[PDB]
Amino acid sequence: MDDDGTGQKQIWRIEGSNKVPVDPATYGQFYGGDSYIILYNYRHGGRQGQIIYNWQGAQSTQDEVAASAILTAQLDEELGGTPVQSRVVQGKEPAHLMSLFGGKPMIIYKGGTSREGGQTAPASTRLFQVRANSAGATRAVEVLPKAGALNSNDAFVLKTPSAAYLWVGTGASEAEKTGAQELLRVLRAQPVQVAEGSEPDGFWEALGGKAAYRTSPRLKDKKMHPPRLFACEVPGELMQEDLATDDVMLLDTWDQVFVWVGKDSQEEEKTEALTSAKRYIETDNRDRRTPITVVKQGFEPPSFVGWFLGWDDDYW
């Protein structure tokens, strides 16, 4: 879609059974715990059109999803059945949707709203993982504020009641550094720039203590054979939900192939997958000493988890 993303748009958040207008000053910022509807009006190649994007946050509940279905059908009917429809889950946004916020990164907060609990309040200390894809689309995703959440391939923003830090992983790109800066703007905080490896003591303290985190030779490399996750190939950002718990998945990071074993995958799926990995590495050229590392659901090592966009240790 060559439309440039600058058309007029309206964004609503599913709240209970209704769609509620989102504060226009915050378009581009979303709660991962919620579902949203975006009505985008555009004019391109001399013709006017509309697109309804249904965006489902990674933690949005099934009842919100069911509510959006009703809301979107109503909107569509209201509009005379003219808009183009596109359903999108967090992390799988098309380039055109990412372009709707004038170059700003899509920011995804933890929490959200619910019938039973209403709107959650922001935590006092927060950490955001900022990652951009090859095309440059950038996402700032809030995660738990612990040292273990860091990964060398991205930029991170840590905000506390008393300080802000922009941590730059060794493999982070300028797009990630720039998105981090924009996020800091939204958070109204001035950061202390920190390069991975020369963190001041105040940074580790804010995170509750220094600890090992997600790193490896590949995660540290700025360059980037981008890692591919193959189903028992998964496009978009690598999300924890892409790991089929009843199956076995392969994550190829070039100098290493991980064999991820779902808790409910049958024994034979691991066997086949291992056989396949060996062959995959020999189909090609590379090295025959390419390690094939087996990992089990819930016991993933940091060198594996680092490739994911914002992992939740309790996800399962």
Candidate ranges 200-208, 246-254, 270-278, 281-289; the one touching Ca ion (CB under 5 A): 246-254
Task: Candidates 247, 255, 312, 313: give the one binding Ca ion (CB under 5 A).
Answer: 247
Annotated binding residues, written as ranges, equal 33-34, 64, 76, 81, 83, 113, 153-154, 176, 246-247, 269
145 binds Ca ion per the rule CB under 5 A: no
Cα–Cα distance measured from residue 263 to residue 180, given in angstroms and rounded to the nearest whole number: 35
Task: Candidates 5, 28, 32, 33: give the one binding Ca ion (CB under 5 A).
Answer: 33
Q: How far is the CB of 312 from Ca ion (least distance, A)?
A: 15
154 binds Ca ion per the rule CB under 5 A: yes
Candidate ranges 101-109, 123-131, 274-282, 283-291; the one touching Ca ion (CB under 5 A): 123-131
Candidate ranges 101-109, 110-118, 233-241, 295-303; the one touching Ca ion (CB under 5 A): 110-118
300 binds Ca ion per the rule CB under 5 A: no
Annotated binding residues for Ca(2+), written as ranges, equal 33-34, 64, 76, 81, 83, 113, 153-154, 176, 246-247, 269
Q: How far is the CB of 192 from Ca ion (least distance, A)?
A: 21
Cα–Cα distance measured from residue 142 to residue 152, given in angstroms and rounded to the nearest whole number: 16
Residue nearer to Ca ion on the CB measure, 34 or 242: 34
DSSP conformation letters of 176-222:
HHHHHHHHHHHTT-PPEEEETT---HHHHHHTTS----B--HHHH-S
112 binds Ca ion per the rule CB under 5 A: yes
Contact 98, 106 (CB under 8 A): yes
Q: 14 Cβ partners below 8 Å, 6+ apart? A: 20, 34, 35, 36, 37, 60, 64, 67, 68, 71
Candidate ranges 102-110, 128-136, 189-197, 307-315; the one touching Ca ion (CB under 5 A): 128-136
Residue nearer to Ca ion on the CB measure, 51 or 98: 98
Give the DSSP letter of residue 312.
Answer: -
Residues binding Ca ion: number (CB under 5 A): 10
Contact 88, 68 (CB under 8 A): no
Residue 292: strand pairing partners: 257
Task: Candidates 246, 272, 282, 301: give the one binding Ca ion (CB under 5 A).
Answer: 246
Contact 35, 63 (CB under 8 A): no
Task: Candidates 34, 196, 237, 300: give the one binding Ca ion (CB under 5 A).
Answer: 34
Cα–Cα distance measured from residue 68 to residue 271, given in angstroms and rounded to the nearest whole number: 41
Question: Which secondary-structure segment (H or E) carries 166?
Answer: strand 164-168
91 binds Ca ion per the rule CB under 5 A: no
Q: How far is the CB of 212 from Ca ion (least distance, A)?
A: 19
Residue 89: strand pairing partners: 56
In this structure, the strands spanning 84-89 and 192-195 are unpaired
Q: How far is the CB of 100 from Ca ion (least distance, A)?
A: 21
Residue carrying the six token digits 């738990």: 144
Contact 290, 255 (CB under 8 A): yes
Residue nearer to Ca ion on the CB measure, 79 or 195: 195
Sites of contact with Ca ion (CB under 5 A) = 33-34, 112, 114, 131, 153-154, 246-247, 265
